[PDB]
Symmetry: C5
Subunit: 261 residues, 5 copies
């Protein structure tokens, strides 16, 4: 969302600044519950595990188009990123189960995953499943023809994050054996009672240069941003639980680089 | 366009202030607390009272008139949350932890935030529930939609008024604030312990990557804060936010600039 | 004070070593280091805590080797505090789970001390400057304590009337006062508050750790009238008796402070 | 091995990439990456865990481009300089719909949580291990390699229990640790976090590198042109809807950068 | 000391390696590394813990190459400890949840070791200097222990009468004594106490970590009488038996210390 691209060229020197956000793809079970999943089911036998599409958070991604240009290529040098709306979880009056008789609502808590990537091509993913026998729904892209080895490392499960709201977060991780032309960062914190801990500051910049001083190079003059920001579980007054996600901001600086094809 | 730092005898000034917390102040005696929290309101019928909603605090601090032109440049800040030991009173009002025990400490979700800028803090609105009906005397996202639960770029505001912008509705906007520095941490959960450090030896440098601090437009500095420490649980089981004031000491220097006009 | 140069070498350096005992309330002669059992659920309009229930800040004034014996030589010296090594004394005493504490379950050991804690020290050349802040401005504080006077609802946030020196040991309740960040130009203070029923005490000891007390201009606290001021509060958590009653437990703090002679105008 | 100069030539650098699958017990063909359900409350005199209940260390020998023989010219060995490593599949624990006990009526499944151990090593020879037992009287199964001649002293430090991690899916994690008295030619890193309610906390990034050079600037030297990687990544316990519990493990990726080093022998 | 290796190379350097066993109480011959089960709720006026219930500090004197035939010199050569590498041994043993421990719930695995823990080591040129502090000054400590003498209520805070040397292994209860920050001029010590009934043990191992033992003047512990002292306490937490009874569990600690010869003022 909100993609803005600015190229400034003075002679030899060309800079592009990209600003955008990615909305989260938590499942959106109805139009009013944008940012949430469908309520979670539980205790499905591994042999009869058929999760509904709207229950499954997916990775977010966007292809950002750059000024269409040894080759000259756009090189991503820095990123500033932030999770947007962390204070929204201070609403304990709407929908959440009371913590006790006469108390306020229960904060969002529980397992969470915060992840982003910036690359010159789609993020390369490796599939790993909790249960290889899970039957995934139409509209998801999940590991093809999985086996019990898919519960550990099965090198058959290679994919590109090339479609928004399609690759379930539970099925896929960034592939550390690939991604030579992207930088990715994620933290998984698991557990029923895990507190969300989120920091915001406009003073943080991540440098995307590798050990040789080279950033992601934008093949075919396109930049890819990717995210997943599952903040935890929202517990309804009935006890049902729904994932809650938040959008992620990106500001990326790129420069024009002459490079070996 | 920034030129050189002025290096006279009177080229430095120090500003000190504190910001009181704006938790809701539900009666004349409960300054620093919110109204007791409601719970389990349907998203379609969520009408929080004003005194239940903590707000961001801010102050415009007028600076010596200087005047192509000189502007005050904020270089460092020392800041501290004031009165953290008041939470060691476990005899007053709080529910016993168990039969024969002391009162329950303040605990639960918290948010600690401050900013220093040369202009008002720029905010982005994000809601837990876009259908919340916010009370008279609050400034909340205007004409929100389900997209306001994720990122809706319509929701831009300046923190220009005290006791107005609820913390649950607004975050510092990472797409703006070019002339401010902000820092916040949200920690969510029923059982989160407050962890607060005080020392007069800690300094935050406000200079950006180019060595430039916030520049005080119109010879005014803006400080902003929110310090929701957690929930106070009354002996009845009702819960109220507790906030604390924030101290600021800002060092500024005179900076020559080309009038940007 | 206009600060000039550090004085040279040999006897230009002194070390002060001391400890501060904790002031937790000491409800009987056998329970030194503990508070009285905590009360709970007092209405804000009828909150009258007993003295022995209220931990207080510890403080001492340490007299330093006399400088400026030669009053009219026109070269004025003050001791400058440069470094401190400090730690909490007796942290392993909390491994006694056989005495007094409630069993964790049938046949189990005693419950460890845990819960809200506050660890704080300061080193200054004058008394520590405090700001009063109350949970409940209507609290009626007992004889023997020094607490914010004539408080109002504003005293629950920031009321600038409540300024005091930490000028008496075992008198200023920790729950009423904090170091004032708007003052203390001639002291350094450090504190961490961790609140909650189930917080674990986490305490580190090492004789290899040093805190430098010099400010941004390289100047440490300057000891007015050849006096060094140490202050502490080390509330370790709550001790839960077999009945379920709870008492604060505190421990002493050690200080080793290195000072040098500083010329001043 | 006496090290001489780093070689700087054209083919002086190589990269090895691999992953190690976890060895959690694999109690049936469908439950790769899990252990058998845990037994509990076995007397120390009658503790005989089944093989499928015991997570084991993973290890592999990685062959390197052949160098070299003192009679066949100059001596060269690969030196491991850096490693990039991470745990693969951490997001799979976001499946709370399959198998796991509901957290409460109408709730989602219980996340994997509880005791965990994350460990890796890179060496020029097999990892050297020291045996330590919870209970020296534990009878370990066919197919495992456990401390030989265990005694009560094996519950603390029995220097008899020395082994090389030279076999995958054989050395139970609960019986063995890396030996800090050996491993002169390897680097190892591990963290154990124990408890019923411990949250898994796992970071991934392709920007993180661990330098394997020692204080003299020397990395693991790959004897016989082989590198050894070792891992254990027990992520926590999976709680079935019945209340039974199973360990869950995940694979570990390694990318190791090596350079050619001249050596005397 | 379970095992000791002392190597003095051609280059006037000594490397000392040892493993120091924990002293948790050892209530029977099969429960090495554990304490006796804990008692609870003893009145402060009737608190008489049994010896086997009380973990004690571990210590050993390590003999070094005897340097000075001519002890009657104004300058002496002494061993100077420069670095230490240390590790807690056997942390993965706590992954045994099948033996002895109470089930977490019906059909579950055993309860992990958890609760209060203390991890401590020291390297010195002489015995570790200790300060006594008691939870309860009226505790009656058993035969075979060395505990603060003639304690008073001040012994529950700081009573400077309680000075001791850690001069006996398996004798000084951890609950009674701490390293004395007012002494130990010729030793370095490091400890972390984490208290609480549900605390998770968190233990890291790596052979890449080294602690430098030099003071601010670049001088390490100087080994008086050609002896080095290592000291430890590694209480990992409580083991909960299926009955509900609890026992401390401890682990051994490895030391690798590098020393050099220093000419010093007699
Ligand atoms: Ca599909
Ligand atoms: Ca690769
Ligand atoms: Ca591209
Ligand atoms: Ca601060
Ligand atoms: Ca302004
Ligand atoms: Ca009396
Ligand atoms: Ca008495
Ligand atoms: Ca030959
Ligand atoms: Ca060795
Ligand atoms: Ca050895
Ligand atoms: Ca080899
Ligand atoms: Ca001393
Ligand atoms: Ca000695
Ligand atoms: Na008192
Ligand atoms: Na196996």
């Amino acid at each position: 969302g909100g993609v803005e691209v600015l190229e400034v060229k003075t002679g030899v020197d060309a800079i592009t600044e990209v600003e955008c956000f990615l909305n989260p793809e938590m499942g959106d079970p109805d139009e009013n519950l944008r940012g949430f999943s469908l309520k979670l089911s539980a205790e499905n036998d591994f042999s009869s595990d058929s999760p509904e599409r709207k229950m499954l958070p997916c990775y977010s991604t966007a292809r950002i188009p750059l000024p269409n240009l040894n080759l000259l290529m756009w090189e991503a040098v820095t990123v500033q990123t932030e999770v947007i709306g962390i204070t929204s979880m201070l609403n304990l009056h709407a929908g959440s189960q009371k913590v006790h008789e006469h108390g306020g609502g229960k904060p969002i808590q529980g397992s969470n995953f915060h992840f982003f990537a910036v690359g010159g091509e789609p993020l390369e993913m490796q599939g790993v499943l909790m249960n290889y026998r899970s039957k995934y729904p139409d509209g998801t892209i999940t590991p093809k023809n999985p086996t019990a080895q898919s519960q550990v490392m099965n090198t058959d499960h290679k994919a590109y994050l090339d479609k928004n709201n399609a690759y379930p977060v539970e099925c896929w991780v960034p592939d550390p054996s690939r991604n030579e032309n992207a930088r990715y960062f994620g933290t998984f914190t698991g557990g029923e009672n895990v507190p969300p801990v989120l920091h915001v500051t406009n003073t943080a910049t991540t440098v995307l240069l590798d050990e040789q001083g080279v950033g992601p190079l934008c093949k075919a003059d396109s930049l890819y941003v990717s995210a997943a920001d599952i903040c935890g579980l929202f517990t309804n007054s009935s006890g049902t639980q729904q994932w809650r996600g938040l959008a992620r901001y990106f500001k990326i600086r790129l420069r024009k680089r002459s490079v070996k094809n």
